[PDB]
Amino acid sequence: TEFKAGSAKKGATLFKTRCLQCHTVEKGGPHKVGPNLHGIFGRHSGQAEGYSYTDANIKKNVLWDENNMSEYLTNPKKYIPGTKMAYGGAKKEKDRNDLITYLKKATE
Amino acid sequence: TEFKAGSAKKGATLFKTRCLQCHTVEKGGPHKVGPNLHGIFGRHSGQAEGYSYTDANIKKNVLWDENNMSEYLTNPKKYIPGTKMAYGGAKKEKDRNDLITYLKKATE
Numbered sequence A, B: 001t002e003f004k005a006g007s008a009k010k011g012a013t014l015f016k017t018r019c020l021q022c023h024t025v026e027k028g029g030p031h032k033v034g035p036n037l038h039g040i041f042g043r044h045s046g047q048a049e050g051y052s053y054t055d056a057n058i059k060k061n062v063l064w065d066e067n068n069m070s071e072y073l074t075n076p077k078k079y080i081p082g083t084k085m086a087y088g089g090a091k092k093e094k095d096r097n098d099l100i101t102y103l104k105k106a107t108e
């Protein structure tokens, strides 16, 4: 792609420290500040049911792939301006790889 | 995305007339001139097992999404130069939509 696989273990601790505060990755896990992410890849932005998204996320109609996900994670707000996800971004490529490796695997 | 849904019925006849000659979309369908495509989306180019791909397809490490698929279908050779898929391309956006709608659905 324009993405390479990292440590899913490493990625798993990146999440707790960075995503957990607003997210769940488990099938049957609840939405929180952020929506649960089970089954995110191959699915389009704004479709989890029971979640209240911004007009922003919906309209982007992002199709979430490992690659798409990397750019978003760099600067969500730049990528989807008007998004209410308050995360600054994963400046570091190695960080993101790890993370998407993590997601890739547990959102399944 | 940068892709919109079309007629899966229409798409199904585009395939027979344009893809069929070298492909199968069914789980348990055989590779032919081209590889069977069951489960193509979310999977990377060159991974069907038992298929002999060019050095080209492999190296691109394309992650196949509805979107990726559109660009490829326009001009495979431009997109993955050195690819041995002998198809000229689907110049027409509406044609491709239909097709990916079709694939989207039956490669599942």
Ligand code: HEC
Pocket (backbone or CB within 6 Å): A015, A018, A019, A020, A021, A022, A023, A033, A034, A035, A040, A044, A045, A046, A047, A048, A052, A053, A054, A055, A056, A057, A073, A082, A083, A084, A085, A086, A087, A090, A099
């Ligand atoms: C709260 C402080 C958050 C943190 C930390 C992270 N995210 Fe988030 N995320 C949050 C919100 C409020 C939303 C909804 C956006 C909207 O505008 O409605 C999101 C959304 C996402 C998405 C898109 C959801 C979809 O389209 O289904 C993804 C892929 C996502 N969040 C992932 C994610 C990761 C991996 C995080 C840690 C790096 C992360 N977010 C942090 C809120 C919060």
Ligand code: HEC
Pocket (backbone or CB within 6 Å): B015, B018, B019, B020, B021, B022, B023, B033, B034, B035, B040, B044, B045, B046, B047, B048, B052, B053, B054, B055, B056, B057, B073, B082, B083, B084, B085, B086, B087, B090, B099
């Ligand atoms: C024979 C004349 C073909 C026709 C008509 C179409 N395709 Fe094809 N396809 C063909 C070959 C020989 C290959 C392998 C490429 C290589 O370099 O090894 C392919 C490959 C594809 C792929 C990529 C396969 C993968 O990475 O798993 C896709 C997505 C694909 N073909 C789709 C496709 C469609 C939808 C077609 C009709 C428009 C089509 N191809 C025509 C051979 C032939």
